Amino acid sequence: DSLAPEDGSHRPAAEPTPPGAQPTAPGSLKAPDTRNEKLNSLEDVRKGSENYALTTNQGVRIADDQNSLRAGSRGPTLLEDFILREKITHFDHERIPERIVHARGSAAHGYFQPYKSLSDITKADFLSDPNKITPVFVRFSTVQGGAGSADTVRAIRGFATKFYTEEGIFDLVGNNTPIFFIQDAHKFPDFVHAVKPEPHWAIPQGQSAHDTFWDYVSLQPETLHNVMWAMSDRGIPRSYRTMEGFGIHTFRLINAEGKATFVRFHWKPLAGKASLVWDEAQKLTGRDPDFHRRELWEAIEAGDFPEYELGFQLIPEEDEFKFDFDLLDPTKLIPEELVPVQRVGKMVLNRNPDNFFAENEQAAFHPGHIVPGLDFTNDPLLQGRLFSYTDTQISRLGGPNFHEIPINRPTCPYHNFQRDGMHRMGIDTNPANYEPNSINDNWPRETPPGPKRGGFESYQERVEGNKVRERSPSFGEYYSHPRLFWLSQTPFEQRHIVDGFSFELSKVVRPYIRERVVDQLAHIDLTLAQAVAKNLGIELTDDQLNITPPPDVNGLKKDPSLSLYAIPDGDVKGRVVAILLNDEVRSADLLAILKALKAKGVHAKLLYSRMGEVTADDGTVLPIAATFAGAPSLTVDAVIVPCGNIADIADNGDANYYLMEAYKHLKPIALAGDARKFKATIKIADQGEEGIVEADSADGSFMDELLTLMAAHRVWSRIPKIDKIPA
Amino acid sequence: DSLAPEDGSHRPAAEPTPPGAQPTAPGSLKAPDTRNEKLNSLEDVRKGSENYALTTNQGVRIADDQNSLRAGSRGPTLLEDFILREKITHFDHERIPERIVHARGSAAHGYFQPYKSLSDITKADFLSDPNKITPVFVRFSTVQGGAGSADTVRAIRGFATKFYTEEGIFDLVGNNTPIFFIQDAHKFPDFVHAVKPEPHWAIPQGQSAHDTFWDYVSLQPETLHNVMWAMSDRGIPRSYRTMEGFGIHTFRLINAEGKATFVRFHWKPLAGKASLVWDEAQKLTGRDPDFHRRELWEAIEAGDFPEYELGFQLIPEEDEFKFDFDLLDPTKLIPEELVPVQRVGKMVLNRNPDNFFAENEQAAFHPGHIVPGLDFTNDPLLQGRLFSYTDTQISRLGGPNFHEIPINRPTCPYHNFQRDGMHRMGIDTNPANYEPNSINDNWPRETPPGPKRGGFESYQERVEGNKVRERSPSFGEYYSHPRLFWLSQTPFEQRHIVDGFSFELSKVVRPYIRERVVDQLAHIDLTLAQAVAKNLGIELTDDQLNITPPPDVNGLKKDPSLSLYAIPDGDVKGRVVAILLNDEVRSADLLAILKALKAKGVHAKLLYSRMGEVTADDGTVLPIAATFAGAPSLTVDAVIVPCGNIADIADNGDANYYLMEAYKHLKPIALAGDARKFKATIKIADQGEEGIVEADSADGSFMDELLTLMAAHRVWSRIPKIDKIPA
């Protein structure tokens, strides 16, 4: 019609902009100049809209898209309206089956680059040269919930990366914890069914806080290690950018000389590790179920590209049996204290998709999609995975041609004798559809293995034993890893774990299941067990109190790399601050606050009791981002309150409650001049308290003190103080 | 191994039990004796489990379900493991496409029966005899969210009823507001795209509080009427039990003489009308996303069967053109003050399904599934709905044999000449698959229309007009119904409509969209318009302040049946109270509480700061349902604090906050003896305040106050008092 505003305000700028500054938009409109090979190769399917006639799928233009065709303007709809029928028909068939697991996820385009050639240890083309850039598509996710469940639930997160190499797609389909729950793939449906919503009533969505999960866990002690990790703050990450990623399984690197090295893949978050606290995460699933998704998208639109360092734990073939645990057991981790992570490369995510359904929804990642230079191992969990991803995608994606769906296509050439199938796009001209053939001179042809561009040959591992359905006795050890994890945690981390098991176990209706988990915890650590028992009104028996603790892991009593916070890796860029306005802000405070934040790449959100504008003491007009209720403290990392007419919000329940929720969830809080009248709301001494920045104005050290607090993430020392506080 | 507790406490008692008294279960195990003809007919596919051997789907017994088959215990998985491949295959193919709209839904079985024969106005066999029961299957849903989205979001609610009649399936597919947002089916996809997650980033889930929704609404004022209902407390019902249901369109009733009568369908909730408040509801999507689901399932397990009265608005054919709105326009309601709802029958939902997926997820409802005695009209929304339910179902349910899926099958005879199709169950023995045929003597045969048991014949409506794509000029009025709704609401209802609009519009990033919506509100009612503008920081212009209000609706200045609360309809049975224990409960207080609660059918949930048990003063051991934080005030209708050792909880942060939250959400609170010391936490009154029950002990009087309050649902008079509270 010509419905946009004449000021062109309906359209976000094609330049990096801070979160909330502009309406968010499709990747290619938001950042047209951010390219990569894969992004360029999708131009054949991108479709514009501006200046084009509205049409049917057959290209016939539509005159009236507001009405069905009827016999009289008040008459019956006619079957002949083919415009209405194609339109409703496409609408009626929009949905596809969501992923069996990892239905909820958020994705983005990016690129990867190795620091140096790894040719000595792997002939994988994407790792052979530091100037070799490989496009990537990454999808982060939760395990249990459907596609419409919440982001900040407690859960293990999925971390899958599609590498569009020159010698094939390589998918690294990992999680954000270094182990999995089960050992053998045959039990996946059992474990997954136990964690998913119970079969009679489909409750609860996106949560393990229910009977079947803990029932399973309590009868399968192999699960404890990963359960420890999910029960910790690892299970509620601050963002997909602030968690670690792992392949979990031991795989093989094969070099040109044919030598196999055992490898465990890792991703290190260059923004560091940071997690929410439980009450915040649970509230955030309600106030904004799309928090991670939104944050990922906005970090990319703001230029805060999520960056990760690919790392490798490398173990020589000769050291296979040198640990107390089996290298092929997925419920066991390789302590970095024993086997360090070697820095391999950097992955940068710098552009959102155009259409979520087309790119994110249909992305198909598979762990068996490896390339020459990599190989598998006999890890029994991995072994079954190679069966499952290929299988599930014939029904999710409607057929065997899911590789022709734009996001999934190789950027490298692909030729073979495979034909037909639903949705076939490629029109093969080869006179032959079989080999060996003479009619096309046998093309395309097999290709011998070699140092570069050769065919895929599996490493000749010796295989020996009888056909058996048997767990390896080396896998029958379930408690030392959980114990190692436990002892590597800070005290406040240990308390949060205790609190996760406690909350969780309290949602289990059948008491005996709770007791059974407590007994299992007593096999790991008595202090953990007791603390959780106590929260559940359970007493340990004299026998539980004497269970002998599991042995150290290869002599290790703790590995600080297992903690989120024991070793400071804080990084403020991309974090966000809430600024609580009033109707006459000391503009001097605001300029100081704002400039200091921007200097460190920390965003702000101007908040108030209504939308619109307020005018500072000097006449500066301040645009309001959202209300105290509309953009709660759960969505920010810190809260700053500038002086002015504090009496304007001093008695505002929402303004006060904002501070209480923020204080409760250990976020740094800064009160300027009269804003200190809010000290009484959170019971802050006259003298002060670590974690609360206060001054007569937002000058001098005020923002630096506040920014040092943001660097340590949360004010852990405040925990005991929050114990009470009614919020 | 891994067996049941010795004490049989793993399995629920098969009798009515209050919410949380026992683990919930499949309905046929929870209520084996609850039967109806449809329930019974599902018996061919019910599958037990106890005492049976674990097998593949081919019936082969499985010996070891813990392991894959491998060449040695540390070896690779073999391809010949068929047990493992069927098991994982089934698992990989579990998911089917969710419903395009209404993916989130909760269902149950029950029965329907007319109060009296309606044979004078319809020949429909299910309404012809008061002692003729019709088995039903009902599903309640939200519109926008995915199948894993949250229940208590702001949304219209779907209310679909599947009637298994002796003359065919009749599905009455309605919503909880008497109108829909749009006029013509052609605009369905446009509207549902505008409300669903935005296409580039697939945000936000289950919410209309985003730019596309308000943009669409601002450009199409026909939506305003249903938008009014959505922003009022009708958009957040307290349960599926406490909402109304409506078929929206005008359909027809055809009697045996052939007289057509215009009919609008209604359901009256016999538990009364009641809704949450926004903050409660939004917070509840985080604390318990499956709250309506759970509540329905528990009410049914408890014997608090959801009951609805089917009612009819009847308009003689000669009154078609007598209102000042077109009867065929679905953005218009028929005010009860003009055409009264006639009581027709009662529907009781008395049993949950066995398997959610099989029964709820595959259920297929269609507004075109009518039977003889009913018929359509030219409503242009309805007309397009006839095309779509049928079409979507072929992909959603994988083929044209969706009527053979157990929950969807008719209980009456079905015989025709349609053959084949994917997953065909029915093995047809008829020699003929066409008619007319001589080889089977033309069976099955056509049956003439007639008063009872006759074939379907459409009412012979006269059709006169040109083939046009045109909106009837009479559907061109968009403001007087919205105003009628506005003016018929209580003051606190009006405020909640204002706040809903203010909250939602504050989440619209592009400010001109806010503005255009406010301008549309100014066409409806200037008081309303200014209340929203004020909250958005917007100033109406002179022009806007001079928009003439729309006319009354046939002289109606207000209609009290449009409001949830003007006419009191309180019913406390099936509600639930939180009882905050301390560690030395005064058993006499508790005794009295429970007794009074029991006499009115109100359930209790005993809460404490830890799980397990507390012992009252007389040695009674009180098992704890959940902790203060574990089951927040959001989940209960009122709070009772008995005396005893109040010092145990007086300083508990979660206990104080429990009360503050409940207070803020206008729920009745009862404090006894030393519990009255919590009056300071909810910082108000000392002589007391309407809505806070208090006494030296919980007596008969004390409980009568509380039950009276609960019978009014919320403490509306406390509204002015909650916005200073920091909660």
Ligand code: HEM
């Ligand atoms: C170390 C253990 C595992 C890890 C780290 C893992 C990781 C993941 C991730 C990250 C995704 C989501 C991919 C996306 O974003 O599209 C996924 C999906 C999936 N996983 Fe795994 N998984 C593991 C074990 C298994 C096992 C044992 C099986 C079954 C044998 C399995 C079957 C599946 C299937 C069927 C999907 C859906 C994939 C699709 O539809 O494309 N996973 N897994």
Ligand code: HEM
């Ligand atoms: C007054 C207007 C409408 C009402 C009251 C309404 C109501 C409903 C309800 C309650 C459901 C959920 C059924 C269930 O629980 O399985 C549903 C589903 C659906 N609706 Fe409507 N709807 C309306 C308008 C429309 C229109 C105009 C269309 C398309 C022209 C449409 C297309 C659909 C589809 C495709 C489904 C999914 C059914 C399935 O997958 O089985 N609806 N509708």
